Short mmCIF file of C-alpha atoms and ligand atoms in Angstrom, two decimals:
data_model
loop_
_atom_site.label_atom_id
_atom_site.label_comp_id
_atom_site.label_asym_id
_atom_site.label_seq_id
_atom_site.Cartn_x
_atom_site.Cartn_y
_atom_site.Cartn_z
CA UNK A 19 56.24 -68.43 -160.22
CA UNK A 20 58.83 -65.74 -160.57
CA UNK A 21 60.43 -65.71 -164.13
CA UNK A 22 61.15 -63.20 -166.77
CA UNK A 23 59.95 -63.84 -170.46
CA UNK A 24 60.67 -61.64 -173.21
CA UNK A 25 60.65 -61.05 -176.68
CA UNK A 26 62.41 -59.46 -179.69
CA UNK A 27 64.97 -60.96 -181.34
CA UNK A 28 66.11 -60.85 -185.29
CA UNK A 29 68.42 -59.37 -187.69
CA UNK A 30 67.98 -56.06 -188.98
CA UNK A 31 69.72 -53.55 -191.09
CA UNK A 32 72.48 -51.27 -189.72
CA UNK A 33 70.67 -48.01 -189.38
CA UNK A 34 67.45 -49.10 -187.93
CA UNK A 35 65.74 -49.80 -185.01
CA UNK A 36 63.96 -52.34 -182.35
CA UNK A 37 62.12 -52.84 -179.44
CA UNK A 38 63.17 -55.27 -176.14
CA UNK A 39 60.49 -56.23 -173.52
CA UNK A 40 60.44 -58.69 -170.86
CA UNK A 41 57.49 -59.37 -168.77
CA UNK A 42 57.97 -60.62 -165.47
CA UNK A 43 55.48 -61.89 -162.84
CA UNK A 44 54.36 -63.16 -159.20
CA UNK A 45 55.42 -60.23 -157.46
CA UNK A 46 54.47 -59.76 -153.79
CA UNK A 47 56.56 -56.74 -153.38
CA UNK A 48 56.57 -53.22 -154.97
CA UNK A 49 60.19 -51.63 -154.70
CA UNK A 50 62.95 -52.31 -157.45
CA UNK A 51 64.62 -51.43 -160.48
CA UNK A 52 64.52 -53.60 -163.72
CA UNK A 53 67.35 -53.27 -166.20
CA UNK A 54 69.24 -54.46 -169.26
CA UNK A 55 72.66 -55.82 -169.54
CA UNK A 56 74.60 -56.85 -172.68
CA UNK A 57 77.50 -59.29 -173.59
CA UNK A 58 79.83 -57.88 -176.05
CA UNK A 59 81.83 -61.02 -177.53
CA UNK A 60 85.17 -61.22 -175.34
CA UNK A 61 83.43 -58.86 -172.63
CA UNK A 62 82.19 -59.06 -169.12
CA UNK A 63 78.80 -58.01 -168.78
CA UNK A 64 78.08 -54.15 -168.75
CA UNK A 65 74.88 -52.56 -167.95
CA UNK A 66 72.96 -51.26 -170.65
CA UNK A 67 69.47 -50.27 -169.04
CA UNK A 68 67.62 -50.13 -165.84
CA UNK A 69 64.63 -47.70 -164.38
CA UNK A 70 63.78 -47.06 -160.65
CA UNK A 71 60.53 -46.97 -159.11
CA UNK A 72 60.45 -43.50 -159.34
CA UNK A 73 62.05 -43.27 -162.92
CA UNK A 74 65.80 -42.14 -163.12
CA UNK A 75 68.09 -43.38 -166.32
CA UNK A 76 71.66 -44.93 -165.65
CA UNK A 77 72.88 -46.18 -169.29
CA UNK A 78 76.41 -46.85 -170.08
CA UNK A 79 77.86 -43.78 -171.66
CA UNK A 80 78.31 -45.65 -175.21
CA UNK A 81 74.33 -45.86 -175.73
CA UNK A 82 73.41 -42.43 -174.73
CA UNK A 83 71.12 -40.83 -177.24
CA UNK A 84 69.73 -44.11 -179.03
CA UNK A 85 68.36 -46.39 -176.49
CA UNK A 86 65.23 -45.60 -174.29
CA UNK A 87 63.45 -47.53 -171.41
CA UNK A 88 59.63 -46.68 -170.55
CA UNK A 89 57.10 -48.87 -168.51
CA UNK A 90 53.31 -47.62 -168.43
CA UNK A 91 51.68 -51.20 -168.76
CA UNK A 92 50.40 -53.90 -166.86
CA UNK A 93 52.17 -54.45 -163.73
CA UNK A 94 55.66 -56.29 -164.46
CA UNK A 95 56.51 -54.73 -167.57
CA UNK A 96 58.94 -52.67 -169.05
CA UNK A 97 60.11 -51.81 -172.49
CA UNK A 98 63.50 -50.98 -174.37
CA UNK A 99 62.83 -49.52 -178.03
CA UNK A 100 66.50 -49.47 -179.63
CA UNK A 101 67.44 -47.82 -182.57
CA UNK A 102 70.32 -46.71 -184.55
CA UNK A 103 71.81 -50.04 -185.05
CA UNK A 104 75.82 -50.75 -185.44
CA UNK A 105 77.52 -53.60 -186.27
CA UNK A 106 80.05 -52.69 -183.32
CA UNK A 107 77.66 -53.25 -180.64
CA UNK A 108 76.11 -56.68 -181.57
CA UNK A 109 75.60 -58.99 -178.13
CA UNK A 110 73.54 -61.41 -176.11
CA UNK A 111 70.89 -59.45 -173.45
CA UNK A 112 70.37 -60.36 -170.38
CA UNK A 113 66.63 -58.66 -168.93
CA UNK A 114 67.50 -58.24 -165.04
CA UNK A 115 65.42 -57.07 -162.51
CA UNK A 116 65.85 -56.45 -158.79
CA UNK A 117 63.92 -55.84 -155.59
CA UNK A 118 64.02 -53.95 -152.41
CA UNK A 119 63.12 -53.98 -148.36
CA UNK A 120 62.65 -51.35 -145.55
CA UNK A 121 66.02 -49.56 -145.80
CA UNK A 122 66.94 -51.19 -142.32
CA UNK A 123 66.24 -54.59 -144.13
CA UNK A 124 67.53 -53.56 -147.57
CA UNK A 125 67.59 -57.47 -148.64
CA UNK A 126 68.27 -57.03 -152.31
CA UNK A 127 66.87 -59.97 -154.25
CA UNK A 128 68.05 -60.24 -157.66
CA UNK A 129 66.76 -62.50 -160.79
CA UNK A 130 68.15 -63.00 -164.22
CA UNK A 131 67.42 -64.55 -167.40
CA UNK A 132 68.75 -64.30 -171.10
CA UNK A 133 67.85 -64.15 -174.96
CA UNK A 134 67.16 -62.05 -177.88
CA UNK A 135 70.72 -62.22 -179.00
CA UNK A 136 70.64 -58.85 -181.25
CA UNK A 137 71.76 -59.31 -184.71
CA UNK B 17 67.26 -68.54 -160.53
CA UNK B 18 67.99 -65.81 -157.90
CA UNK B 19 71.31 -64.62 -155.97
CA UNK B 20 69.49 -64.13 -152.46
CA UNK B 21 72.47 -62.97 -150.39
CA UNK B 22 73.32 -64.58 -147.12
CA UNK B 23 75.86 -62.49 -145.23
CA UNK B 24 74.21 -59.48 -146.24
CA UNK B 25 73.33 -57.70 -142.79
CA UNK B 26 76.50 -59.10 -141.12
CA UNK B 27 79.17 -57.38 -142.68
CA UNK B 28 79.12 -54.35 -140.19
CA UNK B 29 80.90 -56.39 -138.10
CA UNK B 30 83.84 -55.21 -140.18
CA UNK B 31 83.09 -52.04 -138.48
CA UNK B 32 83.08 -53.59 -135.03
CA UNK B 33 86.55 -55.63 -135.13
CA UNK B 34 88.96 -52.80 -135.39
CA UNK B 35 88.22 -51.84 -131.96
CA UNK B 36 88.58 -54.85 -130.21
CA UNK B 37 91.76 -53.60 -128.14
CA UNK B 38 90.15 -50.61 -126.85
CA UNK B 39 87.08 -52.63 -125.62
CA UNK B 40 89.64 -54.85 -124.12
CA UNK B 41 91.36 -52.08 -122.20
CA UNK B 42 88.04 -50.95 -120.98
CA UNK B 43 86.79 -54.12 -119.99
CA UNK B 44 90.24 -54.94 -118.58
CA UNK B 45 90.47 -51.70 -116.29
CA UNK B 46 86.64 -51.89 -114.99
CA UNK B 47 86.51 -55.48 -114.08
CA UNK B 48 89.82 -55.34 -112.47
CA UNK B 49 91.47 -58.74 -113.76
CA UNK B 50 94.58 -58.93 -116.21
CA UNK B 51 94.32 -61.38 -118.93
CA UNK B 52 91.35 -59.23 -120.72
CA UNK B 53 94.07 -57.03 -122.78
CA UNK B 54 95.01 -60.07 -124.49
CA UNK B 55 91.79 -60.78 -125.99
CA UNK B 56 92.09 -60.12 -129.66
CA UNK B 57 95.01 -62.54 -129.62
CA UNK B 58 92.16 -65.09 -128.49
CA UNK B 59 89.08 -64.19 -130.57
CA UNK B 60 91.52 -64.31 -133.46
CA UNK B 61 93.42 -67.81 -132.74
CA UNK B 62 90.40 -69.80 -130.69
CA UNK B 63 86.89 -68.65 -131.04
CA UNK B 64 86.81 -68.06 -134.57
CA UNK B 65 88.72 -71.18 -135.42
CA UNK B 66 86.08 -73.16 -133.23
CA UNK B 67 83.01 -70.58 -134.74
CA UNK B 68 84.65 -71.27 -138.23
CA UNK B 69 84.15 -75.02 -137.56
CA UNK B 70 80.68 -74.61 -136.03
CA UNK B 71 79.38 -72.58 -139.00
CA UNK B 72 80.42 -74.78 -141.92
CA UNK B 73 81.01 -73.80 -145.26
CA UNK B 74 79.55 -70.83 -147.42
CA UNK B 75 76.53 -71.30 -149.40
CA UNK B 76 76.73 -68.11 -151.68
CA UNK B 77 78.86 -68.28 -154.81
CA UNK B 78 77.52 -65.41 -157.35
CA UNK B 79 76.62 -66.37 -160.76
CA UNK B 80 78.79 -64.92 -163.79
CA UNK B 81 75.92 -62.40 -164.81
CA UNK B 82 75.09 -60.94 -161.52
CA UNK B 83 78.82 -59.19 -161.21
CA UNK B 84 77.53 -56.14 -163.45
CA UNK B 85 74.71 -56.29 -160.96
CA UNK B 86 76.63 -56.49 -157.33
CA UNK B 87 79.11 -53.92 -158.34
CA UNK B 88 76.63 -51.30 -157.87
CA UNK B 89 75.60 -51.13 -154.30
CA UNK B 90 77.54 -48.85 -152.53
CA UNK B 91 76.72 -50.11 -149.03
CA UNK B 92 80.08 -52.86 -149.91
CA UNK B 93 82.51 -49.69 -150.34
CA UNK B 94 80.97 -47.45 -147.48
CA UNK B 95 82.03 -50.28 -145.44
CA UNK B 96 85.85 -49.81 -146.27
CA UNK B 97 85.79 -45.99 -146.15
CA UNK B 98 84.42 -45.90 -142.64
CA UNK B 99 87.35 -48.47 -141.78
CA UNK B 100 89.99 -46.23 -142.75
CA UNK B 101 89.37 -43.56 -139.74
CA UNK B 102 88.66 -45.79 -136.76
CA UNK B 103 92.37 -47.24 -137.20
CA UNK B 104 94.21 -44.18 -136.00
CA UNK B 105 91.84 -44.00 -132.87
CA UNK B 106 93.07 -47.37 -132.06
CA UNK B 107 96.35 -46.65 -132.46
CA UNK B 108 96.63 -42.98 -130.49
CA UNK B 109 94.01 -43.96 -127.87
CA UNK B 110 96.02 -47.00 -126.84
CA UNK B 111 99.46 -45.29 -126.68
CA UNK B 112 98.00 -42.38 -124.65
CA UNK B 113 96.67 -45.35 -122.48
CA UNK B 114 99.78 -47.08 -121.62
CA UNK B 115 101.51 -43.52 -121.03
CA UNK B 116 98.70 -42.34 -118.91
CA UNK B 117 99.12 -45.33 -116.97
CA UNK B 118 102.59 -46.53 -116.89
CA UNK B 119 102.81 -46.54 -113.38
CA UNK B 120 99.78 -49.10 -112.86
CA UNK B 121 100.46 -51.50 -115.62
CA UNK B 122 102.83 -54.97 -115.55
CA UNK B 123 104.86 -55.40 -118.46
CA UNK B 124 102.85 -58.31 -119.62
CA UNK B 125 100.29 -56.08 -120.28
CA UNK B 126 102.23 -53.56 -122.63
CA UNK B 127 103.29 -56.93 -124.51
CA UNK B 128 99.76 -57.89 -124.71
CA UNK B 129 98.01 -54.39 -126.13
CA UNK B 130 100.67 -54.10 -128.35
CA UNK B 131 100.19 -57.52 -130.21
CA UNK B 132 96.35 -56.61 -130.30
CA UNK B 133 96.91 -53.43 -132.07
CA UNK B 134 99.47 -55.30 -134.43
CA UNK B 135 96.74 -57.82 -135.29
CA UNK B 136 94.18 -55.02 -136.16
CA UNK B 137 97.11 -53.72 -138.16
CA UNK B 138 96.84 -56.64 -140.45
CA UNK B 139 93.10 -55.27 -141.01
CA UNK B 140 94.48 -51.86 -142.12
CA UNK B 141 96.68 -53.68 -144.77
CA UNK B 142 93.51 -55.89 -145.87
CA UNK B 143 91.47 -52.62 -146.21
CA UNK B 144 94.32 -51.10 -147.87
CA UNK B 145 94.85 -54.00 -150.70
CA UNK B 146 91.07 -54.01 -151.33
CA UNK B 147 91.39 -50.52 -152.13
CA UNK B 148 94.22 -50.41 -154.46
CA UNK B 149 93.29 -52.43 -157.21
CA UNK B 150 90.80 -49.52 -158.10
CA UNK B 151 90.41 -47.47 -161.26
CA UNK B 152 89.24 -44.18 -159.37
CA UNK B 153 91.11 -41.22 -157.54
CA UNK B 154 89.51 -41.58 -154.32
CA UNK B 155 89.92 -45.06 -153.50
CA UNK B 156 93.78 -44.67 -154.34
CA UNK B 157 94.39 -41.68 -152.09
CA UNK B 158 92.54 -43.60 -149.46
CA UNK B 159 94.92 -46.84 -149.80
CA UNK B 160 97.96 -44.62 -149.41
CA UNK B 161 96.47 -42.91 -146.11
CA UNK B 162 95.31 -46.20 -144.75
CA UNK B 163 98.78 -47.91 -145.44
CA UNK B 164 100.58 -45.01 -143.75
CA UNK B 165 99.42 -45.94 -140.27
CA UNK B 166 101.68 -48.71 -140.47
CA UNK B 167 104.41 -47.44 -142.72
CA UNK B 168 103.89 -50.15 -145.51
CA UNK B 169 102.75 -46.95 -148.26
CA UNK B 170 104.86 -48.61 -150.83
CA UNK B 171 102.65 -51.58 -150.76
CA UNK B 172 100.76 -49.69 -153.51
CA UNK B 173 103.91 -49.88 -156.53
CA UNK B 174 105.19 -53.20 -155.21
CA UNK B 175 102.04 -55.33 -154.89
CA UNK B 176 100.46 -54.24 -158.06
CA UNK B 177 103.13 -54.09 -160.40
CA UNK B 178 105.63 -56.67 -159.31
CA UNK B 179 103.39 -59.38 -157.40
CA UNK B 180 100.64 -59.03 -160.05
CA UNK B 181 103.09 -59.74 -162.99
CA UNK B 182 105.22 -62.59 -161.37
CA UNK B 183 103.23 -64.27 -158.96
CA UNK B 184 104.23 -67.91 -158.77
CA UNK B 185 107.70 -67.52 -160.34
CA UNK B 186 111.33 -68.07 -159.30
CA UNK B 187 112.10 -64.10 -159.22
CA UNK B 188 108.93 -63.01 -157.47
CA UNK B 189 110.08 -62.36 -153.41
CA UNK B 190 106.57 -63.36 -152.21
CA UNK B 191 106.24 -66.58 -153.99
CA UNK B 192 107.70 -69.03 -151.42
CA UNK B 193 109.66 -72.14 -152.40
CA UNK B 194 109.02 -75.48 -151.29
CA UNK B 195 111.12 -76.20 -148.59
CA UNK B 196 111.43 -72.92 -146.85
CA UNK B 197 110.88 -71.53 -143.66
CA UNK B 198 108.93 -68.79 -143.12
CA UNK B 199 112.11 -67.68 -141.19
CA UNK B 200 114.43 -67.44 -143.93
CA UNK B 201 111.42 -66.20 -146.25
CA UNK B 202 110.95 -63.21 -144.47
CA UNK B 203 114.54 -62.44 -144.62
CA UNK B 204 114.55 -62.81 -148.27
CA UNK B 205 111.17 -61.00 -148.50
CA UNK B 206 111.14 -57.89 -146.22
CA UNK B 207 113.86 -56.00 -148.20
CA UNK B 208 112.89 -57.24 -151.31
CA UNK B 209 109.68 -55.03 -151.64
CA UNK B 210 111.54 -52.12 -150.61
CA UNK B 211 114.65 -52.47 -153.02
CA UNK B 212 112.22 -53.32 -156.19
CA UNK B 213 109.70 -50.33 -155.50
CA UNK B 214 112.65 -47.74 -154.96
CA UNK B 215 114.34 -49.02 -158.20
CA UNK B 216 110.62 -48.96 -159.96
CA UNK B 217 109.71 -45.58 -159.49
CA UNK B 218 113.13 -44.19 -160.27
CA UNK B 219 113.36 -45.96 -163.65
CA UNK B 220 109.74 -44.65 -164.42
CA UNK B 221 110.58 -41.19 -163.21
CA UNK B 222 114.13 -41.14 -165.11
CA UNK B 223 112.56 -41.13 -168.36
CA UNK B 224 111.90 -37.45 -167.77
CA UNK B 225 114.19 -34.80 -166.18
CA UNK B 226 112.32 -34.69 -162.99
CA UNK B 227 115.01 -36.03 -160.69
CA UNK B 228 114.71 -38.83 -158.44
CA UNK B 229 113.44 -37.12 -155.39
CA UNK B 230 110.59 -35.67 -156.22
CA UNK B 231 106.90 -35.00 -155.16
CA UNK B 232 105.20 -37.21 -157.29
CA UNK B 233 107.02 -40.56 -156.20
CA UNK B 234 104.67 -42.61 -154.36
CA UNK B 235 106.80 -44.44 -152.51
CA UNK B 236 108.19 -41.34 -150.28
CA UNK B 237 104.44 -39.78 -150.43
CA UNK B 238 103.14 -41.64 -147.48
CA UNK B 239 106.45 -41.13 -145.18
CA UNK B 240 105.24 -37.86 -145.15
CA UNK B 241 102.44 -38.79 -142.61
CA UNK B 242 104.33 -41.72 -141.14
CA UNK B 243 107.11 -39.12 -140.19
CA UNK B 244 104.98 -36.80 -138.51
CA UNK B 245 102.63 -39.38 -136.60
CA UNK B 246 105.32 -41.01 -135.09
CA UNK B 247 107.53 -37.78 -133.96
CA UNK B 248 104.38 -36.18 -132.68
CA UNK B 249 102.85 -38.81 -130.85
CA UNK B 250 106.24 -39.65 -129.10
CA UNK B 251 107.36 -36.45 -128.42
CA UNK B 252 103.74 -35.43 -126.86
CA UNK B 253 103.46 -38.55 -124.98
CA UNK B 254 107.08 -38.56 -123.99
CA UNK B 255 109.74 -40.90 -125.31
CA UNK B 256 108.10 -43.58 -122.62
CA UNK B 257 106.32 -45.07 -125.40
CA UNK B 258 108.99 -46.40 -127.87
CA UNK B 259 108.82 -49.93 -126.35
CA UNK B 260 105.45 -50.72 -127.58
CA UNK B 261 105.06 -48.72 -130.92
CA UNK B 262 107.92 -51.05 -132.31
CA UNK B 263 106.15 -54.21 -131.14
CA UNK B 264 103.07 -53.26 -132.96
CA UNK B 265 104.99 -52.45 -136.28
CA UNK B 266 106.94 -55.33 -136.40
CA UNK B 267 103.89 -57.70 -135.59
CA UNK B 268 101.98 -56.03 -138.68
CA UNK B 269 104.82 -56.80 -141.18
CA UNK B 270 104.76 -60.40 -139.93
CA UNK B 271 101.04 -60.44 -140.44
CA UNK B 272 101.40 -59.62 -144.28
CA UNK B 273 104.43 -61.77 -144.88
CA UNK B 274 102.66 -64.72 -143.43
CA UNK B 275 99.78 -64.42 -145.97
CA UNK B 276 101.88 -63.85 -148.96
CA UNK B 277 103.37 -67.30 -147.83
CA UNK B 278 100.31 -69.48 -147.42
CA UNK B 279 98.77 -68.03 -150.82
CA UNK B 280 101.17 -69.06 -153.50
CA UNK B 281 103.03 -71.39 -151.49
CA UNK B 282 105.32 -74.10 -153.83
CA UNK B 283 103.23 -73.14 -157.05
CA UNK B 284 105.01 -72.51 -160.23
CA UNK B 285 103.87 -71.39 -163.80
CA UNK B 286 105.39 -73.39 -166.88
CA UNK B 287 107.86 -72.17 -169.10
CA UNK B 288 106.89 -71.39 -172.85
CA UNK B 289 109.24 -72.82 -175.29
CA UNK B 290 112.06 -70.77 -175.95
CA UNK B 291 110.07 -67.77 -174.78
CA UNK B 292 108.96 -65.85 -171.62
CA UNK B 293 106.55 -67.03 -168.94
CA UNK B 294 103.25 -68.17 -169.01
CA UNK B 295 100.06 -65.86 -168.05
CA UNK B 296 98.61 -66.64 -164.59
CA UNK B 297 96.14 -69.51 -164.37
CA UNK B 298 93.41 -70.62 -161.92
CA UNK B 299 95.65 -73.60 -160.63
CA UNK B 300 98.36 -71.32 -158.97
CA UNK B 301 96.86 -69.95 -155.72
CA UNK B 302 95.47 -71.52 -152.54
CA UNK B 303 92.18 -70.56 -151.69
CA UNK B 304 89.48 -71.64 -148.79
CA UNK B 305 85.68 -70.81 -148.13
CA UNK B 306 84.83 -70.83 -144.77
CA UNK B 307 82.35 -68.29 -143.54
CA UNK B 308 83.41 -66.16 -140.72
CA UNK B 309 86.86 -66.04 -141.61
CA UNK B 310 85.94 -64.47 -144.81
CA UNK B 311 83.61 -62.13 -143.07
CA UNK B 312 86.74 -60.67 -141.42
CA UNK B 313 89.12 -60.62 -144.11
CA UNK B 314 87.19 -59.54 -147.00
CA UNK B 315 86.66 -62.20 -149.05
CA UNK B 316 90.44 -62.91 -149.59
CA UNK B 317 90.27 -66.62 -149.01
CA UNK B 318 89.40 -66.95 -152.65
CA UNK B 319 92.86 -65.78 -154.04
CA UNK B 320 92.72 -67.81 -157.43
CA UNK B 321 89.71 -66.10 -158.82
CA UNK B 322 91.44 -62.38 -157.27
CA UNK B 323 94.44 -63.09 -159.91
CA UNK B 324 91.58 -64.23 -162.40
CA UNK B 325 90.09 -60.86 -162.19
CA UNK B 326 92.33 -58.19 -160.16
CA UNK B 327 89.41 -55.48 -160.69
CA UNK B 328 86.38 -56.64 -158.91
CA UNK B 329 85.33 -55.71 -155.60
CA UNK B 330 84.98 -58.10 -152.83
CA UNK B 331 81.18 -59.14 -153.55
CA UNK B 332 81.57 -60.62 -156.99
CA UNK B 333 84.55 -63.12 -156.19
CA UNK B 334 83.35 -66.58 -157.11
CA UNK B 335 84.24 -69.92 -155.45
CA UNK B 336 85.98 -72.99 -156.73
CA UNK B 337 85.73 -76.46 -155.08
CA UNK B 338 88.29 -78.04 -157.59
CA UNK B 339 91.00 -75.55 -157.58
CA UNK B 340 93.57 -76.08 -154.99
CA UNK B 341 92.17 -76.18 -151.50
CA UNK B 342 93.63 -75.47 -148.22
CA UNK B 343 92.68 -77.32 -145.32
CA UNK B 344 91.35 -74.88 -142.88
CA UNK B 345 90.51 -71.13 -142.66
CA UNK B 346 93.22 -68.71 -142.30
CA UNK B 347 93.85 -68.41 -138.70
CA UNK B 348 94.82 -72.27 -138.21
CA UNK B 349 97.19 -72.10 -141.07
CA UNK B 350 98.78 -68.92 -139.57
CA UNK B 351 99.34 -70.98 -136.50
CA UNK B 352 100.89 -73.62 -138.18
CA UNK B 353 103.28 -71.43 -140.14
CA UNK B 354 105.34 -70.23 -137.21
CA UNK B 355 106.42 -73.80 -136.53
CA UNK B 356 107.73 -75.01 -139.69
CA UNK B 357 108.02 -79.04 -139.09
CA UNK B 358 104.19 -79.44 -138.80
CA UNK B 359 103.72 -77.40 -141.59
CA UNK B 360 105.68 -79.73 -143.56
CA UNK B 361 104.05 -82.65 -142.24
CA UNK B 362 100.73 -81.40 -144.06
CA UNK B 363 101.32 -78.86 -146.70
CA UNK B 364 104.12 -80.82 -148.29
CA UNK B 365 101.97 -83.75 -149.37
CA UNK B 366 99.01 -82.00 -150.36
CA UNK B 367 101.41 -79.61 -152.66
CA UNK B 368 102.75 -82.67 -154.44
CA UNK B 369 99.33 -84.14 -155.05
CA UNK B 370 97.74 -81.12 -156.41
CA UNK B 371 100.59 -79.78 -158.43
CA UNK B 372 101.34 -82.97 -160.28
CA UNK B 373 104.48 -84.88 -158.58
CA UNK B 374 106.98 -83.62 -160.74
CA UNK B 375 109.79 -81.24 -160.93
CA UNK B 376 108.91 -78.87 -163.71
CA UNK B 377 105.75 -77.47 -162.31
CA UNK B 378 106.68 -77.11 -158.51
CA UNK B 379 109.28 -74.43 -157.35
CA UNK B 380 111.81 -76.03 -155.16
CA UNK B 381 113.98 -73.80 -152.37
CA UNK B 382 116.97 -72.77 -154.76
CA UNK B 383 119.50 -73.55 -151.70
CA UNK B 384 118.82 -77.14 -151.52
CA UNK B 385 117.65 -78.58 -154.65
CA UNK B 386 119.40 -81.50 -154.78
CA UNK B 387 117.89 -83.29 -151.62
CA UNK B 388 114.59 -82.00 -152.34
CA UNK B 389 114.74 -83.80 -155.39
CA UNK B 390 116.76 -86.92 -154.58
CA UNK B 391 114.18 -87.84 -151.42
CA UNK B 392 110.48 -87.35 -152.34
CA UNK B 393 111.09 -89.28 -155.62
CA UNK B 394 110.39 -86.72 -158.33
CA UNK B 395 111.28 -86.49 -161.90
CA UNK B 396 113.43 -84.09 -164.25
C1 D12 C 17 92.41 -58.89 -138.26
C2 D12 C 17 93.21 -60.16 -139.16
C3 D12 C 17 94.00 -59.58 -140.00
C4 D12 C 17 94.81 -60.33 -141.37
C5 D12 C 17 95.46 -59.52 -141.98
C6 D12 C 17 96.15 -60.03 -143.57
C7 D12 C 17 96.63 -59.30 -144.65
C8 D12 C 17 96.56 -60.02 -146.01
C9 D12 C 17 97.36 -59.11 -147.07
C10 D12 C 17 97.53 -59.66 -148.42
C11 D12 C 17 98.06 -59.54 -149.41
C12 D12 C 17 98.39 -60.34 -150.65
FE1 FE C 18 98.34 -62.87 -154.56
FE1 FE C 19 95.92 -58.32 -155.48
#
């Protein structure tokens, strides 16, 4: 059915890199944008990454330049190879995905999951 | 594990509703009967409560980690910007009706059209309150423009600073004590906001040399729109529409004051030992979750979570079934405010039960304290 499995957690040195990925499945649709959302301690979930069918980044301005998010694999696959680790950003990450219908319809179907607590 | 919406297509009925007096007029002139001006007053009191009960509760509460997702679809905010303009049309067009046809109308119909446009002014304020608690510039100036059409442009400073600092507190003029009529309350309330806002911006600017009567004042900034509006509209249509422009305004202010009444009615925040007051909490605000009434007033019946996080658009506001609960949606509770004794037949007992039966947590009307404690056996 519809769920969002992932991989990529651990503890590394501050000044290193790491790669996130979560591969969903069971898609009968083809319009959406799959994105990351991080939860800093004491912080409401802010947006980290998410890319639209065509491909257009919207990060949060604080991660601009270190994090990159790409696809190019079997369907329901997305990557985020993170780098340049700081101890100021250390959080839990949901991998989030969305959906879409004819503009007239535009019934947004949201789906969520979490894991890979960074450092 | 998904948040498929439920009300998604049906938020454009909010573009519709602000035009109910106008098509009320059209219909009442084409069909040739008379009651059809009194149509908003029936929609709001008699078909939306019935329909409320006919649909049921809501089955949509957003979970926690979808808030950063539901605050990125712009549809939910374009549907408020579009509402700002329609409101001027309703006002101007209605007035031009009464004056273009004074000589075929009775006086019933005048009072009726005035009341209808008054209720729709309630919706202007509920589109100004939703576009003030924002952190952008566009939203703030739009808030002032929309509020100007009823003369309540200082709601900005008042609501934000004051209400959000001292809700549920003896010295907030909007927190209603337990044992007080909406009439004596409206007395103590309407001058409260005005006096307070004036002092507030005065003392802000005073730290500087830019004298009290300045430009940047936000209490005398939308009067630059309400003054021309009325001087023009009136001296153009002739002095004939003065008996109808006052009725609309007073009923607007009544709308706002009834809300504040039933929102935080009777509820009080505890005092920290020998210090100041305690920060707001979830169980100091009444809320409901019926469907169509929420669809009209962008979810405002969910007040506790509003105070829980002011900055959050009306699509992430959660719901809670164990915090205090009203008996019904907002229209019937309005219809019960105006008649105080039954109000006391019902919400007295509810307030005693949910707050805790004791006089250190409830806020008793500081004009009759000894009666209010002596009867309704309480503790001190
Ligand atoms: C169409 C009905 C309009 C009702 C207006 C209610 C205004 C509530 C203001 C709340 C301020 C706290
Ligand atoms: Fe409030
Ligand atoms: Fe508020």
